[PDB]
Design a protein around this ligand. Structure first.
Ligand code: CHL
Ligand code: CHL
Ligand code: CLA
Ligand code: CLA
Ligand code: CLA
Ligand code: CLA
Ligand code: CLA
Ligand code: CLA
Ligand SMILES: CC(/C=C/C=C(C)/C=C/[C@@]12O[C@]1(C)C[C@@H](O)CC2(C)C)=C\C=C\C=C(C)\C=C\C=C(C)\C=C\[C@@]12O[C@]1(C)C[C@@H](O)CC2(C)C
Ligand SMILES: CC(/C=C/C=C(C)/C=C/[C@@]12O[C@]1(C)C[C@@H](O)CC2(C)C)=C\C=C\C=C(C)\C=C\C=C(C)\C=C\[C@@]12O[C@]1(C)C[C@@H](O)CC2(C)C
Lengths: 42, 154, 198, 208
């Protein structure tokens, strides 16, 4: 259990989790706010 | 307007592009039964197209003779949304990331085996440190003044 | 027991408990270095005081106007009004004066006690106080600057800084005044809320 | 706090894992994936199983009792599955934000208790009130144990806590049961019960 959390902390796994979260986030942002060349809220 | 451009709300070429795009998607739409799912998808792309061109027209983008938005990065206050404002947002996020990573490296540097935490992340420490990036500009400014930002005689 | 902003959580070691308003709250470690802690003590003092005055001058003229006792423009609409001087002139006045005063205060932050006397009148100096609490002419009623007095100054300052934040963001979303917002809420609270405001 | 070597296990004949000695209430030796293998995670998961158990018991009540009464000529309460869509005296979102604030307070103090046992027992306004519990997950005090049934001898507290955890496990399985039933079948759980009682050989999973 402790060893498994350790394995899940290793560089490639933490990287896939981190960038997968980041990708879902950016995808959803471009889903609710698509296109957009500018920051329109000023 | 600026640089000889014209607002995209006033550009014939811009409206011609919106027209030709929409008619193109409708040419694809004529092939499918209007109740079908490909039809609903092409309708969604059409609505998204209208939203796109209408938003570019609204927010004041200038167009070239090509009928396409051109960005004014000179700093002209009418166009800060095109670079300066997203640029400040970027610098905030990038400064956040780098400040947090630097905080982690400083935190593990006196460990008995530093490289050990560079290949296997100390996630509790990382979670403790991620939100320091929220105030990274004050922290880094204070470090610059205090002399903790730059290593001495390097 | 000096008070805990998070009950379970321990205090940072660098928050001794000798500072007024010390509830052990520095989760991002901004005040870990002591010079940072001094500077931020003065910063919290000045932001808190200006925030108290500002929140007052934004909220009370409005409630007076809405009651009808007086007629004063909204705090955000006060800028557009006509005055006996060009707003540019007003700005240059304000800038010159603040440029003098703030730099004297700053001289006290760096080298305490150094600016305590009138540079014009060599008499009429200030007594030796603590950085951020000038005595003498600045305390005509000669109140006792003790704990609980400073703690109340900091408490009202923090509540007023939060208050100001609420005023600007509120007015941004609602397009009205803060007391107008309070009336709208007290009207039908379960149906007049930031939920319905968005 | 009493080891129980010869306790009845979930898998008769099997050997219990060394981190389950029978001291915990509801210890049948079941952790085949070693999820409570280290003491820290077992502590955490004991609190988890407890909270899940209590929420699932309240939920089993809120599904099964009103569905059962409204199935009779007693109440008019709607189906638990669709109760979220209903319009109450205000919008559900603002109700939910209320919920996140107050529940956030309670869960926050419980949180401080797990991370720092005892540090959270005093009323931050009226200190003379306080809480009597000395074990995490069983806070005691006038609020959470007014009848005092919670402060008692060991072996009695082990009996009662075992009852609580077993009821809560059953209730977890039952709540998810009504969930997957209402998704699979088209009715409330009591209709599944009656339809099954009429023809148990046929009206089952395999009637669809
Ligand atoms: C110190 C804080 C400070 C803040 C928060 C503001 C905020 C504001 N000023 Mg203001 N001012 C401030 C200081 C000062 N102003 C002025 C002079 C003016 C003018 C002349 C005007 C404003 C106006 C405005 C408003 C712009 C509209 C807006 O934001 O809509 C959301 C806004 C609420 C404008 C206004 O009143 O718009 C209604 C305006 O015309 N201000 C001076 C003196 C030179 C100031 C000195 O400190
Ligand atoms: C343990 C808590 C909890 C659980 C297990 C559920 C489970 C459910 N809720 Mg709730 N809800 C819960 C809490 C809450 N809901 C709401 C507000 C809503 C709404 C507004 C809706 C639900 C709905 C639903 C159902 C969604 C259908 C689905 O996911 O199908 C797979 C589902 C059976 C939905 C529903 O009624 O579906 C028919 C729905 O629309 N809930 C609030 C805010 C007060 C809750 C607060 O705790
Ligand atoms: C190629 C040379 C050049 C340069 C360098 C500039 C530079 C600038 N121009 Mg100009 N421009 C140029 C050519 C140039 N221009 C030409 C040839 C034209 C003719 C077309 C124009 C016409 C033009 C116009 C009409 C205007 C400008 C404006 C501006 C300013 C906009 C940015 C600003 O307002 O401040 C910066 C804005 C901020 C909000 C500052 C905050 C950002 C912070 C400091 C960075 C964040 C970092 C981080 C968070 C903190 C750091 C921490 C650290 C201590 C570690 C800027 C200084 C505008 C201006 O004057 O603005 C008033 C404007 O009116 N430009
Ligand atoms: C300084 C304290 C304070 C007080 C008591 C109020 C009071 C009120 N706010 Mg405001 N607000 C505040 C701060 C405060 N706010 C801050 C700091 C912000 C910036 C995020 C906002 C931004 C805000 C928005 C966007 C809106 C309100 C709105 C409202 C009204 C309805 C409440 C609501 O809809 O959700 C409340 C919204 C919040 C953001 C709450 C944040 C306040 C924090 C949690 C401090 C309060 C905790 C404190 C210990 C409890 C009360 C203490 C008080 C007696 C001093 C209400 C009269 C609504 C309104 O104007 O009605 C039309 C609404 O749209 N507020
Ligand atoms: C340095 C090069 C670069 C830059 C400057 C951009 C810039 C941009 N691209 Mg592009 N792109 C690039 C390279 C680049 N791209 C490459 C290499 C590819 C191939 C993989 C693409 C493929 C691509 C596609 C397919 C699309 C874009 C889109 C966009 C726009 C999206 C803006 C957005 O996401 O909304 C705003 C996002 C945010 C504000 C997120 C930041 C907020 C954070 C997460 C939280 C902040 C908390 C405070 C943006 C202006 C999209 C677009 O619509 O263009 C107009 C789009 O459709 N890009
Ligand atoms: C500096 C501002 C600040 C902030 C950000 C917090 C934040 C918090 N406080 Mg604290 N507090 C503060 C100042 C602050 N406090 C001060 C100055 C005092 C002394 C008067 C206290 C004394 C105090 C006590 C006694 C308690 C808290 C608690 C809490 C937590 C409540 C969580 C909650 O409300 O549920 C959800 C909130 C939503 C908005 C949703 C929360 C994280 C409570 C807690 O949870 O303890 C673990 C607790 O019991 N506060
Ligand atoms: C630093 C704080 C501050 C600042 C920025 C202002 C700014 C202003 N006030 Mg306000 N006000 C404040 C605090 C403040 N007020 C406080 C603490 C109160 C009492 C709670 C008021 C009550 C108030 C009233 C009743 C009026 C103003 C008025 C004004 C405006 C006229 C300029 C002026 O005051 O003439 C010069 C100022 C001297 C002190 C001389 C101006 C924008 C007047 C106005 O609305 O103008 C149209 C107006 O009649 N203020
Ligand atoms: C059959 C389920 C069950 C059982 C056996 C227990 C057992 C126990 N609970 Mg628990 N609890 C339960 C359900 C249960 N609980 C539920 C559903 C919740 C969420 C509301 C909680 C939340 C909870 C808290 C917060 C606390 C306890 C405490 C206790 C201990 C105090 C002694 C006691 O009063 O026992 C219970 C005796 C019974 C006869 C069972 C109750 C049957 C009720 C009365 C039926 C009501 C029907 C319903 C209203 C319709 C004890 C070991 C307290 C403690 O440990 O004190 C230190 C404590 O603080 N429980
Ligand atoms: C100065 C100020 C407001 C001043 C307002 C003024 C003068 C108003 C002036 C006028 O109204 C008049 C009177 C008349 C009107 O007609 C015109 C205007 C112009 C409107 C607010 C400060 C407001 C300041 C605020 C809100 C500061 C908030 C800081 C926070 C919350 C920091 C918290 C933490 O930093 C700690 C402490 C520890 C870290 O580890 C973690 C984090 C969380 C980072
Ligand atoms: C089943 C469940 C969990 C099951 C977990 C299992 C089997 C894990 C087993 C193991 O891991 C161990 C232990 C050890 C490992 O080595 C091996 C395995 C095998 C992996 C949780 C349910 C948990 C269920 C919960 C918490 C239910 C709570 C219900 C609430 C709060 C109320 C909801 C409602 O209010 C609404 C929303 C609307 C109303 O109309 C109706 C009501 C019902 C009132």
């Amino acid at each position: 259990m402790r060893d498994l959390k350790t394995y899940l902390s290793v560089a490639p796994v933490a990287s896939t989790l981190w960038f997968a979260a980041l990708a879902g986030l950016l995808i959803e942002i471009n889903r609710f706010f698509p296109d957009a060349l500018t920051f329109p809220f000023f | 307007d600026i640089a000889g451009l014209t607002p995209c709300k006033d550009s014939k070429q811009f409206a011609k592009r919106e027209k030709q795009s929409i008619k193109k998607l409708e040419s694809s739409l004529k092939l499918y039964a209007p109740d079908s799912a490909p039809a609903l998808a092409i309708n969604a792309t059409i609505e998204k197209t209208k939203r796109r061109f209408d938003n570019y027209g609204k927010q004041g983008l200038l167009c070239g003779a090509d009928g396409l938005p051109h960005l004014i990065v000179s700093g002209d206050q009418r166009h800060w949304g095109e670079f300066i404002t997203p640029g400040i947002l970027f610098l905030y996020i990038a400064g956040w990331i780098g400040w947090v990573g630097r905080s982690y490296l400083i935190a593990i540097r006196d460990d008995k085996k530093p490289t050990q935490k560079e290949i296997i992340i100390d996630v509790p420490l990382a979670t403790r440190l991620v939100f320091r990036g929220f105030s990274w500009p004050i922290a880094a400014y204070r470090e610059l003044l205090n002399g903790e930002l730059v290593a001495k005689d390097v | 027991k000096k008070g805990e902003w998070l009950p379970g959580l321990a205090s940072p070691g660098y928050l001794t408990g000798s500072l007024p308003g010390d509830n052990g709250f520095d989760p991002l470690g901004l005040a870990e270095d002591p010079e940072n802690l001094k500077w931020f003590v003065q910063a919290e003092l000045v932001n808190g005081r200006w925030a108290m005055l500002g929140v007052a001058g934004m909220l009370l003229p409005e409630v007076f106007t809405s009651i009808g006792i007086i007629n004063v423009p909204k705090w955000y609409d006060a800028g557009k009004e006509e005055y006996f001087a060009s707003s540019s002139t007003l700005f240059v006045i304000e800038f010159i004066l603040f440029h003098y005063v703030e730099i004297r205060r700053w001289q006290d932050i760096k080298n305490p006690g150094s600016v305590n006397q009138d540079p014009i009148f060599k008499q009429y100096s200030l007594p030796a106080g603590e950085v951020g609490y000038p005595g003498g002419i600045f305390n005509p009623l000669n109140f006792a600057p003790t704990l609980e007095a400073k703690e109340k100054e900091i408490a009202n300052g923090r509540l007023a800084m939060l208050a100001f934040l609420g005023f600007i963001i509120q007015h941004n979303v609602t397009g009205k005044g803060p007391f107008d917002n309070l009336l709208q809420h007290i009207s039908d609270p379960w149906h007049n809320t930031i939920v319905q405001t968005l | 706090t009493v080891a129980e070597p010869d306790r009845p296990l979930w898998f008769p004949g099997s050997t219990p894992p060394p981190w389950l000695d029978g001291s915990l209430p509801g210890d049948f030796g079941f952790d085949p994936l070693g999820l409570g293998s280290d003491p820290e995670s077992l502590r955490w998961n004991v609190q988890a199983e407890l909270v899940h158990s209590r929420w699932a018991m309240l939920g089993a009540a809120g599904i099964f009792i009103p569905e059962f009464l409204t199935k009779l000529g007693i109440l008019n309460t709607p189906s638990w599955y669709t109760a979220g869509e209903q319009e109450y005296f205000t919008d559900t979102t603002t109700l939910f934000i209320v919920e996140l604030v107050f529940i956030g307070w309670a869960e926050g103090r419980r949180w401080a208790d797990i991370l720092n046992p005892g540090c959270v027992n005093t009323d931050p306004i009226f200190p003379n009130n306080k809480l009597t519990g000395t074990d995490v997950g069983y806070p005691g005090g006038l609020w959470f144990d007014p009848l005092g049934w919670g402060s008692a001898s060991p072996q009695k507290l082990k009996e009662l806590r075992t009852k609580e955890i077993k009821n809560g496990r059953l209730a977890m399985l039952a709540v998810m049961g009504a969930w997957f039933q209402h998704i699979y079948t088209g009715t409330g759980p009591i209709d599944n019960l009656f339809a099954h009682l009429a023809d148990p050989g046929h009206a089952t999973i395999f009637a669809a």
